Amino acid sequence: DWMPGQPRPSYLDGSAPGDFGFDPLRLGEVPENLERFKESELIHCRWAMLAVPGILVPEALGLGNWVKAQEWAALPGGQATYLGNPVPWGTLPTILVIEFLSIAFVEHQRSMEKDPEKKKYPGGAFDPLGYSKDPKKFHEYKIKEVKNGRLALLAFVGICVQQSAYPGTGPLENLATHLADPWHNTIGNVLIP
Amino acid sequence: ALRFPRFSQGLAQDPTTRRIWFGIATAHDFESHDDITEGRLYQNIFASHFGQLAIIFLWTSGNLFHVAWQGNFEAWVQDPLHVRPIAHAIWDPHFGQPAVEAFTRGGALGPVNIAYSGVYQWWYTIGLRTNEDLYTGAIFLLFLSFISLLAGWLHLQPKWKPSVSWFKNAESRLNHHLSGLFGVSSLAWAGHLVHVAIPGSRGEYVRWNNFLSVLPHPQGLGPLFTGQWNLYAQNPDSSNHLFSTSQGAGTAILTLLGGFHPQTQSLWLTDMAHHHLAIAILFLIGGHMYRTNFGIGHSIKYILEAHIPPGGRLGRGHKGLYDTINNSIHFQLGLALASLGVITSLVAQHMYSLPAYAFIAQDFTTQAALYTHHQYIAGFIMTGAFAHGAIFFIRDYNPEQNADNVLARMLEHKEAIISHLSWASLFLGFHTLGLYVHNDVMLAFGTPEKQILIEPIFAQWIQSAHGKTSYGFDVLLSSTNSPALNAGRSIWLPGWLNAINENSNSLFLTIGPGDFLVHHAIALGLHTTTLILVKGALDARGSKLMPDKKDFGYSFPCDGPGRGGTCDISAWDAFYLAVFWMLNTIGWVTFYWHWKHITLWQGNVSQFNESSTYLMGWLRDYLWLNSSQLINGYNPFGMNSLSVWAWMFLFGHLVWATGFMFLISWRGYWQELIETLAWAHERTPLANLIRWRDKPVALSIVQARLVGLVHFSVGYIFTYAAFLIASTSGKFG
Amino acid sequence: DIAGLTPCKDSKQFAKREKQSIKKLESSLKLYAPDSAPALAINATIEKTKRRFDNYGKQGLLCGADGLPHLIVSGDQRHWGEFITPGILFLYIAGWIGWVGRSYLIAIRDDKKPTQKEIIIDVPLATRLVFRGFSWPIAAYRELLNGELVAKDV
Amino acid sequence: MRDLKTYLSVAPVASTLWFAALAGLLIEINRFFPDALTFPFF
Amino acid sequence: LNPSLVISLSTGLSLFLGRFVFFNFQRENVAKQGLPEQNGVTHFEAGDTRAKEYVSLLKSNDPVGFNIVDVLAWGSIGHIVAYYILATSSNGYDPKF
Amino acid sequence: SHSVKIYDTCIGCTQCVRACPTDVLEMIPWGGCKAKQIASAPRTEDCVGCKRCESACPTDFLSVRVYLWHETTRSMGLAY
Amino acid sequence: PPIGPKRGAKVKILRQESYWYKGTGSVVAVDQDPNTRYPVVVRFNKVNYANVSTNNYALDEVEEVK
Amino acid sequence: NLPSLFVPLVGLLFPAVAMASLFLHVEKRL
Numbered sequence A: 001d002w003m004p005g006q007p008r009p010s011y012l013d014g015s016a017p018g019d020f021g022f023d024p025l026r027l028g029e030v031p032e033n034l035e036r037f038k039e040s041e042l043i044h045c046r047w048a049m050l051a052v053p054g055i056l057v058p059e060a061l062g063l064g065n066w067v068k069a070q071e072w073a074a075l076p077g078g079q080a081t082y083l084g085n086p087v088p089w090g091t092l093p094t095i096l097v098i099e100f101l102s103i104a105f106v107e108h109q110r111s112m113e114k115d116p117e118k119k120k121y122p123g124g125a126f127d128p129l130g131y132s133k134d135p136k137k138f139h140e141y142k143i144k145e146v147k148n149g150r151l152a153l154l155a156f157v158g159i160c161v162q163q164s165a166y167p168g169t170g171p172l173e174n175l176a177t178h179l180a181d182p183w184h185n186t187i188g189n190v191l192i193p
Numbered sequence B: 001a002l003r004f005p006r007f008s009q010g011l012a013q014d015p016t017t018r019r020i021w022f023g024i025a026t027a028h029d030f031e032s033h034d035d036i037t038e039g040r041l042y043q044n045i046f047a048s049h050f051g052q053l054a055i056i057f058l059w060t061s062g063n064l065f066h067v068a069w070q071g072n073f074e075a076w077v078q079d080p081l082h083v084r085p086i087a088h089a090i091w092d093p094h095f096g097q098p099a100v101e102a103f104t105r106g107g108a109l110g111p112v113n114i115a116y117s118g119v120y121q122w123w124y125t126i127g128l129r130t131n132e133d134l135y136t137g138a139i140f141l142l143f144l145s146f147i148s149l150l151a152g153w154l155h156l157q158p159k160w161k162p163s164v165s166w167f168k169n170a171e172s173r174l175n176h177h178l179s180g181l182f183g184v185s186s187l188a189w190a191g192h193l194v195h196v197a198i199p200g201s202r203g204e205y206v207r208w209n210n211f212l213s214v215l216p217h218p219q220g221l222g223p224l225f226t227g228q229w230n231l232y233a234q235n236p237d238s239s240n241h242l243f244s245t246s247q248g249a250g251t252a253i254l255t256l257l258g259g260f261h262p263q264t265q266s267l268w269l270t271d272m273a274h275h276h277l278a279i280a281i282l283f284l285i286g287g288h289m290y291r292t293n294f295g296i297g298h299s300i301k302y303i304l305e306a307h308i309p310p311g312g313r314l315g316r317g318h319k320g321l322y323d324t325i326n327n328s329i330h331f332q333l334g335l336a337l338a339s340l341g342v343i344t345s346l347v348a349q350h351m352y353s354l355p356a357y358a359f360i361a362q363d364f365t366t367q368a369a370l371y372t373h374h375q376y377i378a379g380f381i382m383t384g385a386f387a388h389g390a391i392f393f394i395r396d397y398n399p400e401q402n403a404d405n406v407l408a409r410m411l412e413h414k415e416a417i418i419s420h421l422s423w424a425s426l427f428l429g430f431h432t433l434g435l436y437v438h439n440d441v442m443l444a445f446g447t448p449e450k451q452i453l454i455e456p457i458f459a460q461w462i463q464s465a466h467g468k469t470s471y472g473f474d475v476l477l478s479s480t481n482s483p484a485l486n487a488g489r490s491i492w493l494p495g496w497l498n499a500i501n502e503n504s505n506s507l508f509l510t511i512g513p514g515d516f517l518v519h520h521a522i523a524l525g526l527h528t529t530t531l532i533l534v535k536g537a538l539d540a541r542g543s544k545l546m547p548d549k550k551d552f553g554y555s556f557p558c559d560g561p562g563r564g565g566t567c568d569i570s571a572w573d574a575f576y577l578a579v580f581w582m583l584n585t586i587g588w589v590t591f592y593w594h595w596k597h598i599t600l601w602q603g604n605v606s607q608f609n610e611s612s613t614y615l616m617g618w619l620r621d622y623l624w625l626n627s628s629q630l631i632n633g634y635n636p637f638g639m640n641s642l643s644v645w646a647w648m649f650l651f652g653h654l655v656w657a658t659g660f661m662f663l664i665s666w667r668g669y670w671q672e673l674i675e676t677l678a679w680a681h682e683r684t685p686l687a688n689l690i691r692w693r694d695k696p697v698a699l700s701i702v703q704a705r706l707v708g709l710v711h712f713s714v715g716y717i718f719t720y721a722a723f724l725i726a727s728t729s730g731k732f733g
Numbered sequence C: 001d002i003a004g005l006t007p008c009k010d011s012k013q014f015a016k017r018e019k020q021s022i023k024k025l026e027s028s029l030k031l032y033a034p035d036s037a038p039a040l041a042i043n044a045t046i047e048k049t050k051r052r053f054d055n056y057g058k059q060g061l062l063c064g065a066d067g068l069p070h071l072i073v074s075g076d077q078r079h080w081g082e083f084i085t086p087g088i089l090f091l092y093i094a095g096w097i098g099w100v101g102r103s104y105l106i107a108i109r110d111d112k113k114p115t116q117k118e119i120i121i122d123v124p125l126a127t128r129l130v131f132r133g134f135s136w137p138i139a140a141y142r143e144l145l146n147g148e149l150v151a152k153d154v
Numbered sequence D: 001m002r003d004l005k006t007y008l009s010v011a012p013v014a015s016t017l018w019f020a021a022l023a024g025l026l027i028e029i030n031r032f033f034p035d036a037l038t039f040p041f042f
Numbered sequence E: 001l002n003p004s005l006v007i008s009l010s011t012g013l014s015l016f017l018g019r020f021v022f023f024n025f026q027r028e029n030v031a032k033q034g035l036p037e038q039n040g041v042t043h044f045e046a047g048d049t050r051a052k053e054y055v056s057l058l059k060s061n062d063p064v065g066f067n068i069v070d071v072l073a074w075g076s077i078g079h080i081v082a083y084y085i086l087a088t089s090s091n092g093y094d095p096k097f
Numbered sequence F: 001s002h003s004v005k006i007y008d009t010c011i012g013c014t015q016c017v018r019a020c021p022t023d024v025l026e027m028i029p030w031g032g033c034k035a036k037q038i039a040s041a042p043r044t045e046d047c048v049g050c051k052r053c054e055s056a057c058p059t060d061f062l063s064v065r066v067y068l069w070h071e072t073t074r075s076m077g078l079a080y
Numbered sequence G: 001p002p003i004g005p006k007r008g009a010k011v012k013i014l015r016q017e018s019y020w021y022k023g024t025g026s027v028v029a030v031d032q033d034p035n036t037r038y039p040v041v042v043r044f045n046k047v048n049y050a051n052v053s054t055n056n057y058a059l060d061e062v063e064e065v066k
Numbered sequence H: 001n002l003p004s005l006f007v008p009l010v011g012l013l014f015p016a017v018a019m020a021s022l023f024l025h026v027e028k029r030l
């Protein structure tokens, strides 16, 4: 139960992975919408779980933060740098056409499959190590993925809001600024200018 | 049938004079004619559309002919800022010699009227230069009028009359209207701009004879197909440029400068060509949305069926709306009139702020006349839109086929809608009137510092958002660090920011508390007019006082004196009531516009700024003050050219007042009076040798509402037109 | 300042208005004996004028080029005295009146002849109910939550 | 006596008394606190 | 920069996507959305003589059913994207970061 | 002539007939109410459309309806 | 057996053209004679626009409400 | 010269003819 003392919704019995009874707006009242929401929630969770380290790790290294790493495309002759290497295809129209064709193909492949249970957990080629072996352990891994991904989503929100509250920052730069003086470096200064 | 009107046997059998009147007022209501069918309905409408188009072409042809044959056009082109244009000549055998003298002006041989329609600036801007060009135009339009009559006649004979199924093919008509009627027409117009109008702007006279020899651009066609279009934006006209000349002339045919031409004070012709080209592309690509004969496209019905929110807060959503609208010509006319009224006001608001015609912004009588013109047109069009919403609810609306969709739910909670429009109108009315009256009392007691003057800080903040510096809010486009400012610095922003911060033009005029108050009066008028019309449409099928109203039709006198009294209970009566409020609202709008500009044009902006915050200021410093030249158009000491506006000014005052008769006196009084008159005629020797063929009766109840509203409106419009034109043109500034 | 205005304490036009007003009243004052009652009245109007302009200058009102106060209703915290604060006062009083009238109508609605107390006021009941308006925001909020504020299925 | 209090409770009379009191109040408030475009006490 | 290159690439990629990628989606949507109909029946059955769709042109010996109309639609897209990239490359426009 | 109709909500109080100033309406036998009578409009060619009958009906909603229609010398109340 | 609702019962008016539509009224007497098309007699707290406070309704036009 | 022909033509002759003709059509009995 997400909120002790609160009656769980009628349609949330706790059986689903990551189902703690949280839908205060009753957005899953219709079952079709709820299933679609489980799929989409997992998609966001996995994009976030991939994108958070892609945001943090290049910052720990000498490379720019996640904001600076997008900046060459604003200027016309822009060329990307992967690990300091001016990659030749780094021009914006190149990687842009590449990204459109590749992403569009893959994601549209997800659009043209309706199991619907495979739209959440397809497996097969995407489970070569076969972690779907024990359905108990596979379901516990479902709770694992859902909580990890929700955590990553919250973290991403923290990164975007910190970026708005300190334009041209880094999550770890913000963290270090806090570690300097935690009692005088806080969200309190942003909430209260 | 058996006599006029042949379309109504019930009217032809009327022995009274009513038969004639109602024969006229019902001639176009085809659905009420005897033996009407759907096919006859659609076919009569279609032919009527061709007839209208023919009227429009013939009218513009007449304007062209008269400017060419009696006007100043050729002389006006050489000196746009010192030649009064000529509408047409005056041949009136009632003129005394002083009228012949005083109306002879504009450098003409006899009395003439100065045109305030602004067709000289338009035709000059689009490339017309000689009276010969105008004659070619007029004959071309007379030709088009004739072919309109020809097609309308043609589609009334069988095998040329279309089936109703063809009229109800909505997807095809939308594809052709978007892609062809909107898109291709706009594209061709861009053609005329780059081939004729822009050359004429650079000194080149391009006509049908030589337009194949001349290139529109030195490199043209080739940079278009290569995909390097910027070569067309390359060499624009110089900021020092003379419009009829090659001085400062560039070669660019498509630009996005953003401001005005410094000489003509109007939009850049290359800007306008680029505009019509781009929106033409948008209409072309957008006109491929719906499905016809090729196995691709949308079923509008299916899209409407699909847009039903889960959770059911809109019930069944938009299901059944495709047939509800496609089967109801009144629904279609309502949507068309609503949209057309919005964009008519939009035209009014954008043509005074962003003038598109050379040397039109300096002609102040024309700018005022056009703004007033289009705002009143827009008002009437809006009232009509709601009228046909109501007529839809009565004649075409099928409750079972719209069950629990959004449209039926409008009726289902009509009391919340009507009651909240009533609340908004009461709040706006109480407080706008209250603040005006407070300020008037303060100025009466000599304490202007006690007024309630609220800064229109939200609109001011929007003007700052546009880059106006008058208020120092330092927001986007008004601020240096704004991404919105950086993104457009290289394109339109230099010309735009240049134009908005020029103090002479009407581009986002500076606003103060006087503008706050009138804007809230305008809000009041929109809300009250809308309240009347919406209540009329939603109560057209019935109320608690008349639950069976749908069975009585759109227009009926009333339901008798029972149940408390029921006068003006029909939907038509709600329209009739709302027209008064529309005339009031557009009166406030146009008073506002004309006073703000007439003070701007005099360099005396302060007079508006200080005097518009109390109503005596409007009465004394606007109407009373600017009637001075008008009311002296003729007097015991002589006449001048303003006499026609003085006369008309009273004419309106008369017609308006005559309307009051039909609106205050009701029928029974006149019916008894006419009975005494019938007795008088029959008992008078020599005269009783003459007998009436139609029994004289008093006008109908509804008929009197209409006749009185028409007098009220004609007097309204003619009065304000006389004052507007005389007060501006008399000063010309 | 805000909207291009200037504080009335810094406005030349504002001080010119105060000057011209006072000199006008003094022009009227020159006609009467200084001991007379018209004289004392014009002096009282003069003192009231000075009090007026001095107070508008003190409390931070911005002026236009007209030399007259303009009110900032945007919500800017420097000008809550010009709208937001008198506005909250108004909403308190209006809510009081309407809440009391509603209390009266509910109180008489089950009487044998309700209209009888609408044309002849039950003043004892009214006096009992007038001071419910003091706590009208709590009462109306509690009714909104409890479902007693809005009639069911209307 | 009872009938007279009843008459004095009738709509127009109660209205004149009520608005007359309100008018005296507002007049005196504008007498001790004249002019005032704002709530100055903040 | 080369118009033939960009137009050929964009149009070839558009035809390709419409042929091997988005074809099934296209067909299931144009099938479930179906022909426009007035009063519960198609415009042609309702009596519009010119509302009969053209089944001759829609027949194609292309195995999957890709026909002239598909060519026209997707090729139109490819040319609009193509002239978009062409016109946008010769701009010289650059936003101030 | 104006159309006049009666609806079976009629309770047969006779007031529409009593109110009519041109004698358009009658009371005919019927079994649907206690008064065992229902109104009728057999002479609408004399109907002038004043709706005194409608003012007289106690039924909610009305059981007489006057639908003003094609005008005649009789419906316009002309004595000339 | 008695037809219609009990006398004194509160009923909701379902006749759409009734002034008291979706309101309530008290039952007075239900005429047990069949062939009477509108046997239910309802009295109302408020007069309608004809200053009438009672009206007869059909059995399917009244809905007993407590 | 031409206005001296067409102003009375459409301001006198045309309204007289149109009013008389419309009068006849409107008073006709079939």
Ligand code: CLA
Binding pocket: B055, B058, B059, B060, B061, B062, B063, B065, B088, B089, B090, B091, B142, H002, H003, H004, H006, H007, H010
């Ligand atoms: C339809 C727009 C229109 C308008 C509003 C006017 C308005 C006017 N015209 Mg003009 N006129 C027009 C078109 C128009 N004209 C056209 C297309 C031609 C042929 C090129 C003329 C040729 C013309 C001449 C020669 C003269 C006028 C004159 C006049 C003025 C006096 C009225 C008159 O003499 O009757 C108008 C005379 C006509 C011949 C007009 C008929 C022309 C076409 C065929 C109109 C169709 C009429 C049709 C039978 C009825 C349709 C009703 C309506 C919609 C037109 C007047 C201000 C006189 C003037 O200037 O006085 C100072 C004058 O001498 N007009």
Ligand code: CLA
Binding pocket: B421, B422, B423, B425, B426, B427, B428, B429, B430, B433, B524, B528, B531, B532, B577, B578, B580, B581
């Ligand atoms: C100066 C002319 C005038 C005025 C003041 C009004 C006033 C009003 N009309 Mg009206 N109207 C007019 C002309 C006018 N109309 C004409 C010519 C027509 C054509 C017949 C219409 C037709 C019409 C329709 C069809 C409708 C209105 C509506 C309204 C109300 C609109 C809401 C509002 O503004 O809040 C109130 C605004 C006011 C200006 C009220 C002014 C009086 C204040 C309250 C004085 C306060 C009393 C003060 C203490 C003095 C007491 C005196 C003492 C002896 C008791 C409003 C009361 C609409 C409506 O009802 O809105 C809900 C509506 O539907 N009007």
Ligand code: CLA
Binding pocket: B024, B025, B026, B027, B028, B029, B030, B333, B337, B380, B381, B382, B383, B384, B385, B387, B391, B554, B555, B572, B575, B710, B714
């Ligand atoms: C594309 C626009 C459009 C279209 C095609 C229609 C179509 C129709 N309307 Mg609509 N309507 C419109 C716009 C439109 N209207 C607008 C803008 C308004 C607001 C003014 C209305 C308000 C409206 C109402 C209230 C009604 C209609 C009605 C009708 C129907 C019959 C009209 C008729 O036969 O009367 C024939 C018309 C005339 C004989 C015109 C004579 C009266 C005019 C107004 C006087 C002219 C002014 C004066 C002479 C100017 C000269 C002054 C002089 C000193 C110079 C018809 C289907 C009627 C209907 O059938 O309802 C179901 C109806 O009652 N319309």
Ligand code: CLA
Binding pocket: B045, B046, B049, B050, B053, B166, B167, B169, B170, B172, B173, B174, B176, B177, B179, B180, B181, B182, B185
């Ligand atoms: C490309 C093919 C095509 C084209 C060009 C048209 C064109 C037209 N049709 Mg048609 N239609 C078509 C296909 C087409 N249709 C097909 C295939 C069908 C069967 C499915 C129909 C069935 C149909 C019917 C039933 C009717 C029409 C009608 C019309 C006319 C509308 C009236 C009008 O003048 O508005 C013109 C519109 C514009 C000029 C563009 C919009 C104007 C904008 C919004 C406002 C002004 C813009 C700009 C600022 C102007 C500057 C002002 C300045 C120049 C002074 C119009 C000329 C109606 C008609 O009038 O009958 C004759 C009518 O009844 N159509």
Ligand code: CLA
Binding pocket: B419, B420, B422, B423, B426, C097, C098, C099, C100, C101, C102, C104, C105, C121, C126, C129
């Ligand atoms: C108990 C008194 C009372 C209450 C609580 C309300 C409440 C409301 N009215 Mg109403 N109204 C009232 C009296 C009241 N009204 C009276 C006396 C009239 C006739 C003058 C009206 C006429 C009226 C109209 C025309 C409208 C409303 C509207 C509204 C609603 C929006 C608020 C508003 O516009 O206020 C506006 C208030 C007025 C116009 C007049 C109020 C009169 C005084 C200030 C209140 C009555 C005091 C009363 C005598 C107290 C008796 C004391 C008692 C203890 C003995 C709202 C629910 C609007 C609506 O429908 O909203 C959707 C709207 O259109 N009212």
Ligand SMILES: CC1=C(/C=C/C(C)=C/C=C/C(C)=C/C=C/C=C(C)/C=C/C=C(C)/C=C/C2=C(C)CCCC2(C)C)C(C)(C)CCC1
Binding pocket: B330, B331, B332, B334, B335, B338, B342, B385, B386, B388, B389, B390, B392, B393, B537
């Ligand atoms: C009754 C009825 C009817 C009618 C109705 C009507 C008449 C309506 C109307 C209406 C109207 C008259 C409306 C209007 C509107 C508007 C809107 C809705 C707007 C829009 C907007 C926007 C969204 C914008 C935005 C923007 C931009 C784009 C840019 C700049 C800035 C801004 C923000 C401005 C019908 C027939 C249908 C049916 C039956 C019933």
Ligand SMILES: CC1=C(/C=C/C(C)=C/C=C/C(C)=C\C=C/C=C(C)/C=C/C=C(C)/C=C/C2=C(C)CCCC2(C)C)C(C)(C)CCC1
Binding pocket: B281, E011, E015, E071, E072, E073, E074, E075, E076, E077, E079, E080, E083
């Ligand atoms: C036989 C065959 C084949 C081949 C095929 C081919 C080779 C194809 C072609 C196709 C194509 C190759 C097509 C194309 C194109 C199309 C279209 C349809 C187009 C278009 C265009 C447009 C539409 C344009 C527009 C515009 C303009 C005009 C102006 C401005 C600009 C723009 C863009 C807007 C294969 C082997 C594969 C397989 C087997 C069989």
Ligand SMILES: CC1=C(/C=C/C(C)=C/C=C/C(C)=C\C=C\C=C(C)\C=C\C=C(C)\C=C\C2=C(C)CCCC2(C)C)C(C)(C)CCC1
Binding pocket: C073, C074, C075, C084, C094, C095, C096, C097, C098, C099, C102, C140
């Ligand atoms: C802040 C501010 C502002 C704004 C405002 C707004 C935007 C608002 C909104 C508002 C709203 C949107 C509201 C609403 C409403 C709703 C509803 C739904 C209602 C209700 C009510 C009621 C229910 C009442 C009741 C009562 C009481 C409580 C008392 C008296 C009696 C009675 C019963 C009346 C401005 C800038 C201007 C100025 C500054 C400040």
